Amino acid sequence: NLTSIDLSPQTLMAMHISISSQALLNQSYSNLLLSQQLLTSQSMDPGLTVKIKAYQNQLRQQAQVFKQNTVAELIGLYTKASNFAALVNAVNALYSTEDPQVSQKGAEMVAALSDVAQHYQAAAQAVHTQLQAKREMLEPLMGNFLNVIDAIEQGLNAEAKQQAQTIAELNEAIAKNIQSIADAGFKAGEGVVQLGQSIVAAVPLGPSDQASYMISGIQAISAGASGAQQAVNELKANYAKLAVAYRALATANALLSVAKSVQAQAQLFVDTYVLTEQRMALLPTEWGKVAEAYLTAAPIINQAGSAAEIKQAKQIISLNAEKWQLFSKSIDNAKANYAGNNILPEVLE
């Protein structure tokens, strides 16, 4: 009986919001990697200088790819959801009970949307397979650069290892702060996201070439109106300490200080890329659930041949339409955010 058909978006609304959350942030981490000053100096360890410049270059290539290609691929999948909402409205409009065969024509269209949902499932799979491929190339790229930093650190005296750990610990703290700020800006999908950037630290380089390597860091847009004031205060305090800690490690190991600064930025990008891939892994299945739900619903909608059965079906469809319209708005805002969040503006005090 009709009482059992589910023409709803299921967990698509929430599933798209959990994707937006990481993809939008990863958009900002891509902008950070592309804004960061390159290492120019050729007056330091020739062997390690080439490993940093090579890694920094390989990261900007992947940041550009994510920013220009992968974001567009996602906006494509979101549009497909709007499109589906629009089609459900049409089914609603068809139930103006003017038509003497209204239930056979209704069944036919629900059966057709089952097909569309199956295409949107396959479209999502295609995007996930590309994200999975990049993940499998990014993990070993970062993994290899970590083994390079580690080999260098394993040969330092105790004073330098402590200066290096202080830095590693602060980068880990700063990442938790940024995440807290981004969550507050995002407002669980209903927010209009913006993150900024500024120079936060510097690495003096032994004695003009590149007097100093300038370190770019994410910043909140409003140092007193973001709805995560404690995180903004911790971020300010942590950047202050980060500046001091690089000045310390730099006295003796300047080039390692640089390598660490780059790896901290890579970590944010690769970690949230992995989370983007993982949230996207569930999307094809969720479209497939809409496909199965719509396939099962159609023959049941066809059995409705009475006055009260057609009235009940109009009601079941009108309700599920409202659900898709609400979802369509969540999508409109996500697309506006992917457009607006394409730039990571400078912030000044």
Residue numbers in the entry: 3 to 209, 226 to 367
From the paper:
To further investigate the differences in lytic activity between SmhABC and AhlABC the crystal structure of soluble SmhA was determined to 2.78 Å in space group P212121. This crystal form contained four closely related molecules in the asymmetric unit (rmsD Cα between molecules of 0.4–0.6 Å), with no oligomeric structures observed. SmhA folds into two distinct domains, a compact five helical bundle (α1, α2, α3, α6 and α7), and an associated head domain containing two helices (α4 and α5), and the β-tongue domain (two long anti-parallel β-strands, β1 and β2). In all monomers, there is missing density for approximately 20 residues between β1 and β2 (G208 – A229). Residues E192-V205 (β1 and loop to α3) and Y231-N250 (β2 and loop to α4) of the β-tongue domain are largely hydrophobic containing only polar uncharged and nonpolar residues, and are buried in the core of the protein, packing against α1, α3, α4, α5 (residues A272-Q283), and residues N351-E367 at the C-terminus. However, in SmhA, NheA and Hbl-B, this region has an additional extended loop and short helix that extends the length of the tail domain, a feature not observed in SmhB or AhlB. AhlB and SmhB use both a short β-strand and a short helix connected by a loop, while SmhA uses only a short loop perpendicular to β1. As soluble SmhA, SmhB and AhlB all share very similar structures, we propose that the head domain of SmhA would also unfold into its pore form about 2 hinges in the same way as seen in SmhB and AhlB, with hinge 1 between α3 and α4, and α5 and α6, and hinge 2 between α4 and β1, and α5 and β2. This would result in the pore form of SmhA having a similar extended helical structure to that of AhlB and SmhB. In this model the mixed hydrophobic/hydrophilic residues of the β-tongue head of SmhA form two extended amphipathic helices 36 Å in length at the ends of α3 and α4,, sufficient to cross the membrane, and thus with the potential to form a hydrophilic lining to the pore.
Tripartite α-PFTs are members of the ClyA α-PFT family. Proteins in this family undergo a large scale conformational change from a compact soluble structure, where the hydrophobic residues are hidden often within a β-tongue motif, to an extended pore structure with the hydrophobic residues exposed in two extended α-helices which insert into the cell membrane. Here we show that S. marcescens has a tripartite haemolytic α-PFT (SmhABC), and propose a mechanism of pore assembly. We present the structures of the soluble A component (SmhA), as well as the soluble and pore conformations of the B component (SmhB).
